[PDB]
Symmetry: D3
Amino acid sequence: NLHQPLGGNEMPRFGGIATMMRLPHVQSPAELDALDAAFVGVPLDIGTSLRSGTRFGPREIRAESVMIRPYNMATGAAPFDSLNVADIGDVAINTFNLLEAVRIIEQEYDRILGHGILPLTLGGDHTITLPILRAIKKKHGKVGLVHVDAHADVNDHMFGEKIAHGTTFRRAVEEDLLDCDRVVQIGLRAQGYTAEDFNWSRKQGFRVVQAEECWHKSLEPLMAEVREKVGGGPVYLSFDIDGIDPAWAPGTGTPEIGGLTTIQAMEIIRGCQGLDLIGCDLVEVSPPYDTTGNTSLLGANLLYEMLCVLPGVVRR
Amino acid sequence: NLHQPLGGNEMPRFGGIATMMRLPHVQSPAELDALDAAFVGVPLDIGTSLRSGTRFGPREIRAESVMIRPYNMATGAAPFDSLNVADIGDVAINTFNLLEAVRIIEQEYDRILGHGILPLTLGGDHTITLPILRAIKKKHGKVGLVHVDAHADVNDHMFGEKIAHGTTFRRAVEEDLLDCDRVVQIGLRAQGYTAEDFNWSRKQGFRVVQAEECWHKSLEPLMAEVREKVGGGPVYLSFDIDGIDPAWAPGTGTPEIGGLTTIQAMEIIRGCQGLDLIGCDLVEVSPPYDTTGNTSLLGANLLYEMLCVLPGVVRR
Amino acid sequence: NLHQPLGGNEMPRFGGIATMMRLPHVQSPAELDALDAAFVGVPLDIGTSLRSGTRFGPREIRAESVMIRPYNMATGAAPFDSLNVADIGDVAINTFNLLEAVRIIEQEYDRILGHGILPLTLGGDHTITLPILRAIKKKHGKVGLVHVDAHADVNDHMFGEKIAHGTTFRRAVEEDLLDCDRVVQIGLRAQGYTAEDFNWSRKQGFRVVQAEECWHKSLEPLMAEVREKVGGGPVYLSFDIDGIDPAWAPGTGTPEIGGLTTIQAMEIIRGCQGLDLIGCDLVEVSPPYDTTGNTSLLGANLLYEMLCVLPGVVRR
Amino acid sequence: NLHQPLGGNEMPRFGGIATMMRLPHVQSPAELDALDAAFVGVPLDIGTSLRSGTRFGPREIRAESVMIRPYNMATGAAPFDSLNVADIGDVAINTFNLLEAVRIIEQEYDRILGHGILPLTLGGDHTITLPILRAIKKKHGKVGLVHVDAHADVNDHMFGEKIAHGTTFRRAVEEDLLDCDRVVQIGLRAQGYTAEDFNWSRKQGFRVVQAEECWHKSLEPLMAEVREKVGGGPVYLSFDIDGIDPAWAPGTGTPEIGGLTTIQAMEIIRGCQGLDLIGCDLVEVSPPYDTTGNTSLLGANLLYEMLCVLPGVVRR
Amino acid sequence: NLHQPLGGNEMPRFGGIATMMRLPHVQSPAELDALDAAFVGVPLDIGTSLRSGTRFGPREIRAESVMIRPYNMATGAAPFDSLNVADIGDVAINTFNLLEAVRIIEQEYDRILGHGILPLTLGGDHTITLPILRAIKKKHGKVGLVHVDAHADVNDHMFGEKIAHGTTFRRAVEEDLLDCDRVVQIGLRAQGYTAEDFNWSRKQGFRVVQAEECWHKSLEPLMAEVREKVGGGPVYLSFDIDGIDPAWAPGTGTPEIGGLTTIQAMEIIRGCQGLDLIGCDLVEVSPPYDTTGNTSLLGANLLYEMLCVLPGVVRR
Amino acid sequence: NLHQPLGGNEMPRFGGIATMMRLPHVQSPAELDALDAAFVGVPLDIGTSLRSGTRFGPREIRAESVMIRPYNMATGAAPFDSLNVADIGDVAINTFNLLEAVRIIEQEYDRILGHGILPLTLGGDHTITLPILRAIKKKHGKVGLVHVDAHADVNDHMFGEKIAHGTTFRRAVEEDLLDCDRVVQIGLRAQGYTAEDFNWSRKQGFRVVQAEECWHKSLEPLMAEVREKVGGGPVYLSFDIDGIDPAWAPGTGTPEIGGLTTIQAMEIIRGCQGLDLIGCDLVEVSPPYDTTGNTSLLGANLLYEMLCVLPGVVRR
Ligand SMILES: [Mn+2]
Ligand SMILES: [Mn+2]
Ligand SMILES: [Mn+2]
Ligand SMILES: [Mn+2]
Ligand SMILES: [Mn+2]
Ligand SMILES: [Mn+2]
Ligand SMILES: [Mn+2]
Ligand SMILES: [Mn+2]
Ligand SMILES: [Mn+2]
Ligand SMILES: [Mn+2]
Ligand SMILES: [Mn+2]
Ligand SMILES: [Mn+2]
């Protein structure tokens, strides 16, 4: 017995209660022990430097997800034949105190990994990834990283404060959470202050791929290099939506011109097949800055492709 | 131990799964036997004559309802300390055949009344009220009526067809479902073909109140006349959203200028206190014609006022 | 046989070619000689001082008019049983030269009045009313006036130029076109420079009714006073849409807070019954500043009430 | 005599009555006999499975078409010098009964072909193509097909019903309307249930081209293979708007990510030159789900390119 | 010499740098000494319980203000002939730490009062009023209060925290900042938990005026009673925009149905003439939840009426 | 010391007065003589032939520009370490008379060049470029030109008038302002009347590059040929926003399908390095036809790339 999404011949897709992919809602400790993987949300926006609004991200992603079917026509992957999956709700953060919210997040992820669940996370601003990595290292050790973004996110401070959505990866290196020689950053562009704005990462041991190197091309051959750099151990995956061009994704906090296409984004995720993935996330979707709901529709479709490449999924 | 809505100190209101008023989702036969009343939806729009879109009605009303609290500051009513209430989901209609859909509605409402539950319905176009009244009459006998609308809805045909959203109450009289001496219609205005468009109702025994009789006035004295006319037995309440002026409710299928205010709408519902109510509905909300979400927020608040005046509710 | 609008049982109201009220389109010399009244448009916006866009006015009004039925339930008026009416198209203005556009307008209205037709005009900014009144005097002589607006429109100049949308009624007085002892202005409010901004009109002989005199009241008693002041000869009616409060009409060039309601606007037009009317207009609707289409819908419904009160209409 | 679109020096393009490309409206029997080709509309949406609204499709396409000029700069084609063309209105469907509407469509297309006119159709959902093909076969016999879509549309049933917008081309094979060896389908993608969802078509004799085969490329060499396959007889062209990526076409019923560009769409239509075309259509545009009008403007421009490639048109 | 706003005959109102009412921007110490009053902004939103976005409040209010003229036609007030006024910019808050932001606000207002300036403040959420009152008391002593809102704002905690946007006036009583016998609250409505939610304020010494007491009437007689209650010393004025009905002001954080009109709001402010006012504010405007820009336009016009009633203004 | 833009550690980017890139505002004769270059605006829209609204162009471009940082990561350019730059305001045009507005433009640009300043212009419709070139020729002599557009703009007349937004470059040839052997036009497409619509330019000595020559290609090799053709003397750059595909830039007056990408636009500007540029402009942005603000954000970012390639700028 494995859980399945609701079909159109059972109930029309414009109706029914709106969970992720119309799946069952599980809460008890006894039933949590029987799951292989699960969807979960974290509604925080008090770490933003420009536009707010990403507190409503998890709700709109769930609402648009009612269109998706179970079997992948292009690759042949069928995850609902192999694994047991469900929707487990949201985390209750403190919206009036930032450092108190960070404490709560680490505590709840300690409980999830205790039951043996691999998480797929709906955000939320980029500050959330720091306390998540604190719990991951306690279970697995030092990890590798594949990071998609329009910004490097390695600032020393923001308005004199140490913890914010632009300092996440500077803190991770200082706390000894990563294996520095197994890291790649893809999509960096736009303006800065000095040449050291990209050169600091290269000196630590990272490989940096700017958007100019991606223009006019397919990224199928590039991912062979990426597998060579990060492989030979456990790996985490983190995706910022502002990496994609605003023609496809207008609903976000800090947009930048001339970026990646949606075809190119599909080539990256499908090319992760063969790695030892231990967790994934999708961040920075902001509903009040897109009227059509198209940005949220894109996020749900990319989360489906992530499930398809987890270890143990059969092809038919 | 009665059901209660989720509080803001447990989980912030922009988070959590979106059921009506964030209540439990009841599905088992044993749990259905223990309920006094419940919210339920019917997503149909294939009976409309102008704009479509009311199939998404029940989904948006649930989403905006997250801000309602349980105690009435003005009247003192407290329904959740008196009755056992929950959310029971949607009815699975056939969107490709209109006559088959009408059959499905009567069948499912026969089962709901079998468990001993009083229904509060979310629509959906005005064709739904006909098969609902068929099930009511079998249980209680002939009933009275309070009807709020900008139109009469008593046409003999529409493009040659007998069953449509503008013929509902003509069919109800021919089938012997109503007590003709206990009926009132409130809000009628705009254009027609001849004088018989309003005079047909008066001939059958109904009392008609045109919008011109409502301008510049408080409606507390009017509702005293209403209670004297329709009292002495059981009664049903049916509310079309297009009775209210488009300045307050722009998202609907057939709008008409110069109508009732939201202050006057509150005076109507609160004035039903004392009657033997056996069921209620709220129809014709259409999401894609109002981008702010304000029309759906209005609908959720009015449904709460309806719950406060049911028989058996205590005051503190 | 007289012309009739297209009915619903002939073709559904969402289809068909989009003329005003779905009426015939008339062009020949013989067919023009046989009409008692007609609808006509003038698409000009090069005389505006803040927001532009009223050039699209005539097109959106026609599109929202498809809802209107032919008989008046409240008053009993039936215009299509007594008069011969149709749609005669638009005037071909020069959008690159303002003074040349003014010359074209006077010439074409000389032709319309030569056929014996009474015009009902769709605008367009308020500059159009000057060359229209020039043609009216040639046929009828000096006339009285009923004027609804939030502004006085009696400036001596605008950026040094003599002809603009805020100088219209200053020029009409200087050119000896009006009977000064038969004029009323209704709805003026907001800010100015000195007390003479409203007092100049009073010195000429006009009556001025400020918005403060209208607050909280029905306007039926006021219109009894108005009829005795302006009666005894021919009269023209001119309606600027910014007279109505922005809660009902946001799509306009220069809006002002705290104005008249739609109920009050209906009381003004219905109270003109009994006067010798020779022409009417409805100006300043701007489509790109209202996304719902509600401002254009209000405009079409008010023009129908204007048709109902013309001399020669039968009651049934 | 030859019909021509209205020029800018006669009347500014934001003015005048809104027919397709501002052409004459033809209604009499004598004038219908003299036409070589014509534009016509069918406003139906009661066969949709997700979002509704394509009933307003034909009205918005006409309104945005006021921009187009007669001469093709790239190809040298000039259709208005070789053929006599006009706008003939809409078909009067029954919006309360699906099977009754299907009967009406076949009967009215029998009359159109009786005058000897070649049709270019504005939709409307994809159910309309079935009864159109029933009428075409009676005049020409069995035909070949070029089909552009994101979906296969070969279902056996939908919620138990045989006639719906996803069963169209399954019914055509069973009724013997096509030559199975002269058919191509271009653009299919996304999720399904089993591998047989694409392989059923291949077993019948069709060639299938998935979106992955199209990425990063020019489509000029592909269309040379297409002309060889379907040539040697009469052929029909059918275009579903959801074949194009949502970055360009957000206003539609069932969107899917990562599709074709507008450059690739022009390469397909221009590549049909030399074939014996007998009819064309453009379906599934839904106005209430796009807030700019950009989806309707694209539809109007693609229909102009279809006109340029008909037999009889000369190059200069 | 006194500062004046820019006129239309110098530069058209759609052009020029967008300061408040197009006034000079003052920065130097010597020029600050010579001002009688000034406009100033505080862009904070990290204290909100539901919707965020009021950080952009000050920017949109400035842009919509380019319409206002200097002389009051109804009251005859002329503030620019009596006082010296300008725009002085924004306060630089810390958006990553809430308690540090409160410290910064108190320090800067100590400086503004040191130059001898009376402040008119643009917000910003309701947490800002607490540090402002801490600075007022040092100069003047304890003060009276006129407060317009749909909520009481007297909570002890929010999610366990003492300082938030719903606890403002509870902290003010504890710290001895007010004279409890000279306070009035106007406009409270909707749902709660117990009767004590409104009863606490009555026992302290306040007068409470619910929305039900205001329905259907003019507020001229009420304001005469208010002047008697709060007169005798210095007084502050605080205006929450959610006190007005959502038909006029949809762009706000926590909306509630059935409220005050804009006519009633005008009667309140104009009725303050004669009191010893020492400061004013206008809070909670949120731009991303109102696309038209009408909520911001309302806020700018209400601020002008506040300037007219300050002590020392002449009438002509 | 040279002028610098404001940083985030001084004041958060959602606050502060909105000048271009948050730079100082310069007005005095003494401070003007000290500037090497400056930003300046011209708000005209009375010469358009379809949609109006580009009068608000300069205001929205300023508001979105608050995001830009000073150092170019890709090229290494640093303009703020080399040149002295500021914001100098708008030109006061006559919105009621087109010919008088043209006289005003030429006069003010004579004064700007008299101070020795190189201009970077914000528009405004394409009529403004004619009077600008009249003042340029008086100072420098005959000049070369790089022109980006979807249209040729070489009409002899519009509606009988010789000065309009589509005749600009025809007038420039007749008045002897250009070196005809040093001109290139890039991006022309869509429909016309005859083959001479593009062939007139070829006969004068121009090179024409149509859109079909740009499809599927990088534009680096093209710009090497362009530099050879126009070099060896002073040169002007003019950029019409409708040259880019409507997927990226929907807010414009006359849009055409299937154009250039934003990647291709970046390759054009960066490829101008090495030329003797004397002035630049960016025209035809219309805010009310794009609600997201994305069209204005694109315009601001392109103007920064123009500043980076001026003679005298150093690389690091
Ligand atoms: Mn980023
Ligand atoms: Mn990031
Ligand atoms: Mn109705
Ligand atoms: Mn109804
Ligand atoms: Mn006005
Ligand atoms: Mn006016
Ligand atoms: Mn499809
Ligand atoms: Mn299809
Ligand atoms: Mn409040
Ligand atoms: Mn408050
Ligand atoms: Mn152009
Ligand atoms: Mn141009």
